[PDB]
TrEMBL record:
It comes from the Bacteria. One of its GO terms (molecular function) is metal ion binding. Belongs to the phosphohexose mutase family. Residues 6-141, 159-256, 261-367 form the Alpha-D-phosphohexomutase alpha/beta/alpha domain. Zn(2+) binds at residues 243, 245, 247. Its cofactor is Mg(2+). This is Phosphoglucomutase/phosphomannomutase family protein. GO terms for biological process: carbohydrate metabolic process. Keywords: Isomerase, Magnesium, Metal-binding, Phosphoprotein, Zinc.
Amino acid sequence: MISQSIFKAYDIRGVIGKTLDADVARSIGRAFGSEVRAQGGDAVVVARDGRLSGPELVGALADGLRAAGVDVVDVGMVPTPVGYFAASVPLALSGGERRVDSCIVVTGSHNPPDYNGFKMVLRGAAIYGDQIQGLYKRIVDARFETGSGSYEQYDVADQYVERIVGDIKLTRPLKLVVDAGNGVAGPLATRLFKALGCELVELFTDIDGNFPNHHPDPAHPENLQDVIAKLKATDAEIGFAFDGDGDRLGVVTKDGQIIYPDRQLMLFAEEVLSRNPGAQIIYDVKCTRNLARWVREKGGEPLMWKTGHSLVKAKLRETGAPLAGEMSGHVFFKDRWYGFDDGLYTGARLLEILARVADPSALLNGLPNAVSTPELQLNVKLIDKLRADAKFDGADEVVTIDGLRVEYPDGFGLARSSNTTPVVVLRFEATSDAALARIQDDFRRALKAAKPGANLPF
Ligand SMILES: [Zn+2]
């Protein structure tokens, strides 16, 4: 029997042999195919990353979709944004062109080898919260549509590469270190950047779902140590590291500096706004205080939003903005693109900009910067105690779109609830070391008042 615990806020995730197996994939396919037909759709693209359980689960998923009466277009093993891309453009199928606007990618993303999961787009929307709980409920209830959908395999890689290459022409070749952590990003990302004219020093770009080198998880700096060492030991100029399904890009300079995605977004916003005067640029409440001012000085309108990739995507579709990015490293180009997050496309857009200068590392390092703390763990209940009763000494505003973002003249504090983990997340940024300390001291005393007696992590 299916476990409700695999149905998360933004996707479905489980562990092979424990909460996830072929039967589970099939019921999820049947539930999702049923929702597609109830919205009048008749087809779904499916794709997988390079995990060992991938081929079995994507086959079971396809069986379930077809049992609901939905046709399946299988684009095989490709990065996640390539499945999004297949759900965005006309497909030159053997029975004629066809447009298919829902997809499911079977992928465990940055997680250990035995994890896997499903990322779901239903008629262009990245479904979350109640719509995902509604798939679990159809399964419990056996409330399904019935039919006999067709199945076809389709390789969408050539259309994808040609679509990017035909719009991006680098000023000069740039020599890159590309680290895929043995994840699905490696083959097509290397193909793409070679197609743009770059020479590559490859790290772990062959598929190996045992992840025998380092997990493809650029969110941990320990997984970037190979790219940093390779940049010291070769004449490559810039390092790119992908997470396991390619919807996130990590960027390292020649001198070993990680460029966090809020700084990356400044560089993209500048170039995008130069062609879109006045446009909104969306980012989440974890991003640097520096973005608001940067975006204004560059002639745009900053729009600070909630954290969560699917929430940022919904907001992009609501506003028609040309660009969004989140601290976690998903970057969404609607300008000249399709508006889904894509690590390989972001890489290409970054090379377009970096190739205009002789020293890309100086360009990246010179982006605005500040001092910060790492993330701290302490949900929901205490966040409300804080909102109603906290005397934050000297703050300019307490922002409440997502937790409490407290803004000071010289930095900011954020306390919020996660959307998987059952505890409160904190982060701090300031314009000097002493200002970082005073801000924490301020949060410290507020949390001592709100939940008096608890052991804090700072
Ligand atoms: Zn990912």
